Design a protein around this nucleic acid. Structure first.
Ligand SMILES: [Mg+2]
Ligand SMILES: [Mg+2]
Ligand SMILES: [Mg+2]
Ligand SMILES: [Mg+2]
Ligand SMILES: [Mg+2]
Ligand SMILES: [Mg+2]
Ligand SMILES: [Mg+2]
Ligand SMILES: [Mg+2]
Ligand SMILES: [Mg+2]
Lengths: 392, 240, 45, 238
RNA sequence: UUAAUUUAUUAAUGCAAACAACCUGCAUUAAAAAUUUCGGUUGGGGCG
RNA sequence: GCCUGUUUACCAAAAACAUCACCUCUAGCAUCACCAGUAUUAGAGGCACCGCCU
RNA sequence: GCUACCUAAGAACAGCUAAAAGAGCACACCCGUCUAUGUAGCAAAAUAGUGGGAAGAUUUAUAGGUAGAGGCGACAAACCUA
């Protein structure tokens, strides 16, 4: 079955006048008249050259002629790619071993109550209420508005800890930063072009979480595979691409080391929003991409086991549900499935609050649920603060 | 009228396509089919009825993972998003197809009969006689056209030479080259018969509208009548 | 109840009786030609 | 080759005895043609031993072109004559595969259009008595209209009791006798009669003896005289 | 409408024509139609 | 009359039309309706939800 | 540009009762049961009260489409600019 019905397909041009089939004579066309007439032959116009040149009337050359066109087809993961297998596919692509829960090294940074924010719950509740109810004159703010607001206000609340932690002065949250990292996986060359937003950069690299012994123990772990789904599925197969490793910044940039990638799924529509598993996969891929760009910038473009692993964190949220990730890139030798493997600690589906009532539900003239968040969980904010404080 | 068919998309896709209702109207704008109009807005999911469609630069039998089984507004059967290699496609789901199941699409006519597992597609030559089938092609590579509605199942009645006799759900025999592919099992949504519309409003939701003057010929509907022969004219309307 | 059959809209007026629609068919061209022959100040609507 | 043909006939359900019988039956018919013909017959749902019997009775079938044989088989399948239905058809009238497509089609079209028989009824008629195909048009229409208008019979009864199988001469001989005797009455415009009419099985299916003893209650001599009189009447009318 | 007249047009077949499809001509049968009519006497109508 | 609905704009809102339900008839199939459908489908006609006794 | 049906993309539907309803009462809104007024009238079909529906087979704005032996018709020979 062929798609596209004939009536919609472009109409076939009318048959050429028989006068054109007679070798010796020049047909008399309405070309001289400069307008159509039905009783004269239709001219054969030579193709027009000066057309597709003006900037506002430009036609791009065929993809084959573009400077970066390559016969070998790369598989790019961009911000709007949704992995079918999700976390498993991301782990295979990045040669990563998954560890449930955040590492104790970062989780201990908030165990002591000194790091606990004064009026922490009050401030977080005010942040949630402002994002979800008080943000606008409109009664119910949309996700496109309350997800960035909740993230930024939480980041400010964490940054308020500069009192206890002067090391927090050596960091800055940049927006619209874009990184690109290419690497091979079983003769398949994969690129990640991470655009996202809210890259938390620090002047100092994050300390490694996994020790040499754990990194070596990753050798025994077998990289889970899925069949018949190829790991390439849902990745943009593109022949136009650049193999350069771009960290997103010019050389000499202060705060060169990525600290946390804040990915937010703020689409108002559920189909336009990532599933939680696909969001975790995107977090894995973006953290791996930033770490790999850093590694290629620092230790050169050589496939090898990293003596100093690169650690990149990421927080992926939909405004209510958060996912926390710490990714340790400890190898740039990705092509083989064997050897030491990168490792990611993920804490999944940490919901800051169960639900938010913008309107007071009234049954039989009785207020059942008051306006505000329900099922608020300070533990998720503790984890968020721990991730922010890591490295300080 | 300025009617252009909505079926203009040329490239297969998984995304539901916005389909325009017709109201039973031709491209001329006149009613051609009565009783159609309105109903819930629908999106069309392009079904790949050629189950043995090996991916680009690939060949041979291939397996596919059932990502999900979904209700289809445009069919009695429910459909299945199924993914193989690096592609995803919509196929017609069989009765017991589940998410996470594995499906085989083969062009191999084995000398022995292949074990017929529900949901997989084999050439009709490879199936045992008496197996229930659906999504049957008429010609090799044409694409499934027969036994596609919910709960339907043809029977592989016979296989002789390179020709197989299939019993269509209308209990009519059909001859097809044994190289034509069909999938094993009955189509899903087997309870489609038992659904009760309940009220006229549900049919109106389904897009069926009450329509009269369905014939447009002079005098409207007129049942066929036997025209008596001249010898028999004397007995047509004998009085009591 | 009746009498207000005219519910004006310039889009409909131009699309139904305008110069372009009149010229779009040979019959409408003859409409314009008849109006021109009669000397109508307004050829189309 | 004979090897391939023998292997195929070992398949398809045929036993060596019937295979040898058919091979002997071959009247200069190539093994390829015989294999194709038998394949088409079993495609039509016919069992190996009825295939053997039919080919024995009518060897002319093996001479049919394979294209024509396939076209006729497809047409019969469309008409619904297949599986066990085709068996008694190929016994009562084995020439259907030799009849003209136009003849079969016009018989079916007369049955459906000018006689208002459902598709199922047409299949039932063809299955029960293929002599309808031999019977010429016009005569068939006259028989049907005799059953419908003059006799007051309906399509379900005409199909149930194989009225079209019986000859028009016999039908008239018995019906006119009954009507003139007053034991049979044409239904009125309302479709009713003063006395219930005898059944078509009692009229046509039975023999002359019981027909004149139970339905007519008259004498065989009187019936013979009436038959001769009716023959004269028909000859004079035509 | 079982009033009269047609079948131009479609749909089937058939025969020629072009070498199966497609198409032309001529026929036949239908479908769909088209055109046309409504004598006189007897309170009216039925049957006359 | 099953029901909610529809109708003679401007004398009829109904028992009429429709309607779920059921029955009958026709159709084995692709790129402009039916339908990007395939007999649990589609088209047409009848009847009247349903339930029981024969 | 009315009306009938359809297409595309919109919009409206308080409150109470009930709980995912071609649900109940009842606004907006749609209609037009009955009565009265009016009858060259305010009106070439209106007014007042009463009444039916009022989350649906609902109502409705916009643009488009189907054309006269044709269209459209939940058939009233209804409607297609009084
Ligand atoms: Mg209007
Ligand atoms: Mg009623
Ligand atoms: Mg009502
Ligand atoms: Mg009225
Ligand atoms: Mg009224
Ligand atoms: Mg309400
Ligand atoms: Mg209601
Ligand atoms: Mg209506
Ligand atoms: Mg009526």
């Amino acid at each position: 079955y062929e798609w596209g019905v004939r009536s919609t397909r472009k109409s076939e041009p009318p048959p050429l006048d028989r006068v054109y089939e007679i070798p010796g004579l020049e047909p008399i066309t309405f070309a001289g008249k400069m307008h159509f007439v039905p009783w004269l032959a239709r001219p054969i116009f030579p193709p027009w050259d000066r057309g597709y040149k003006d900037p506002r009337f430009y036609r791009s050359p065929p993809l084959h002629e573009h400077p970066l066109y390559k016969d070998q087809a790369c598989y790019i993961f961009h911000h709007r790619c949704r992995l079918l297998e999700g976390v498993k596919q991301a782990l295979w692509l990045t040669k990563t071993k998954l560890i449930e829960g955040l590492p104790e090294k970062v989780l201990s940074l908030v165990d002591d109550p000194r790091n606990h924010i004064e009026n922490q719950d009050e401030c977080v509740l005010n942040v949630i209420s402002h994002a979800r109810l008080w943000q606008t004159t409109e009664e119910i703010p949309k996700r496109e508005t309350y997800c960035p607001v909740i993230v930024d206000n939480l980041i400010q609340l964490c940054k308020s800890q500069i009192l206890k932690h002067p090391s927090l002065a050596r960091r800055i949250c940049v927006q619209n930063s874009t990184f690109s990292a290419t690497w091979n996986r079983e003769s398949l060359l994969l690129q990640v072009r991470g655009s996202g937003g809210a890259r938390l950069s620090t002047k100092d690299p994050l300390p490694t979480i996994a020790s040499r012994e754990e990194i070596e123990a990753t050798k025994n772990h077998v990289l889970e595979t899925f069949y018949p789904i190829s790991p390439i599925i849902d990745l943009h197969e593109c022949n136009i691409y650049d193999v350069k490793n771009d960290t997103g910044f010019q050389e000499g940039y202060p705060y060169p080391y990525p600290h946390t990638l804040y990915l937010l799924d703020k689409a108002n529509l559920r189909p336009h929003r990532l599933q939680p598993d696909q969001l975790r996969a995107k977090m894995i891929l973006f953290a791996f991409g930033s770490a790999l760009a850093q590694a290629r910038l620092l230790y050169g473009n050589d496939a090898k086991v990293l003596e100093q692993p690169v650690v990149v964190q990421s927080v992926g949220t939909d405004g209510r549900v958060f996912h926390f990730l710490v990714f340790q890139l400890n190898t740039t030798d990705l092509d083989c499935n064997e050897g030491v493997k990168n490792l990611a600690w993920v804490d999944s589906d940490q919901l800051l609050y169960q639900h938010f009532w913008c309107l007071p539900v009234i049954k039989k003239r009785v207020v059942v649920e008051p306006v505000g968040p329900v099922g608020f969980k300070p533990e998720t904010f503790r984890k968020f603060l721990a991730l922010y404080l890591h490295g300080a | 009228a300025n009617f252009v068919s909505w079926k203009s998309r040329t490239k297969y896709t998984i995304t539901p396509v916005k389909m325009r209702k017709s109201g039973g109207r031709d491209h001329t704008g006149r009613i051609r089919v009565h009783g159609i109009g309105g109903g819930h807005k629908q999106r069309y999911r392009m079904i790949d009825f050629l189950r043995f469609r090996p991916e680009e630069t690939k060949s041979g039998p291939f397996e596919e993972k059932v990502i999900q089984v979904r209700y289809d507004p445009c069919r009695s059967a429910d459909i299945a998003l199924v993914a193989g290699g690096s592609r995803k496609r919509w196929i017609i789901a069989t009765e017991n197809m589940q998410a996470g199941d594995t499906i085989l699409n083969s062009n191999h006519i084995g000398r022995m009969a292949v074990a017929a597992r529900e949901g997989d597609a084999h050439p009709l030559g490879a199936l045992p006689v008496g197996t229930l089938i659906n999504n049957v092609e008429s010609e090799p590579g044409r694409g499934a056209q027969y036994i596609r509605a919910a709960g339907t199942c043809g029977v592989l009645l016979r296989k002789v030479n390179g020709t197989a006799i299939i019993q269509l759900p209308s209990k009519r025999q059909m001859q097809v080259l044994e190289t034509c592919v069909a999938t094993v099992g009955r189509v899903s949504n087997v309870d489609h018969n038992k659904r009760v519309i309940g009220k006229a409003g549900r049919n109106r939701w389904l897009g069926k509208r009450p329509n009269s003057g369905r014939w447009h010929r002079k005098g409207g509907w007129a049942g066929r009548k036997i025209r008596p022969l001249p010898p028999m004219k004397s007995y047509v309307k004998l009085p009591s | 109840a009746r009498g207000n059959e005219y519910q004006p809209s310039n889009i409909k007026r131009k699309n139904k009786h305008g110069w372009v629609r009149r010229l779009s068919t040979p019959a409408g061209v003859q409409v314009i030609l008849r109006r021109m022959l009669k000397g109508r100040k307004s050829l189309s609507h | 080759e004979l090897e391939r043909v023998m292997s195929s006939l070992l398949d398809m359900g045929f036993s060596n005895a019937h295979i040898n019988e058919l091979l002997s039956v071959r009247r200069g018919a190539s093994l390829q043609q015989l294999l194709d013909i038998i394949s088409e017959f079993i495609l039509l749902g016919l069992n190996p031993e009825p295939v053997c019997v039919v080919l024995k009775k009518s060897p002319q079938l093996l001479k049919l072109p394979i294209m024509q044989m396939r076209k006729r088989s497809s047409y019969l399948q469309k008409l619904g004559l297949g599986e066990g239905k085709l068996k008694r058809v190929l016994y009562c009238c084995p020439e259907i595969f030799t009849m003209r497509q136009q003849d079969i089609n016009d018989t079916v079209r007369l049955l459906k259009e000018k006689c208002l028989f459902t598709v199922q009824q047409v299949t039932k008629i063809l299955h029960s008595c293929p002599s309808v195909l031999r019977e010429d048009l016009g005569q068939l229409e006259y028989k049907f209209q005799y059953a419908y208008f003059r006799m007051g019979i309906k399509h379900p009864d005409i199909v149930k009791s194989e009225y079209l199988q019986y000859s028009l001469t016999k039908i008239k001989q018995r019906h006119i006798y009954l009507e003139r005797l007053g034991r049979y009455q044409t239904p009125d415009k309302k479709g009713q009669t003063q006395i219930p009419n005898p059944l078509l099985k009692d009229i046509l299916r039975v023999s002359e003896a019981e027909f004149l003893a139970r339905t007519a209650c008259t004498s065989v001599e009187e019936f013979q005289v009436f038959k001769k009189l009716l023959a004269r009447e028909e000859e004079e009318s035509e």
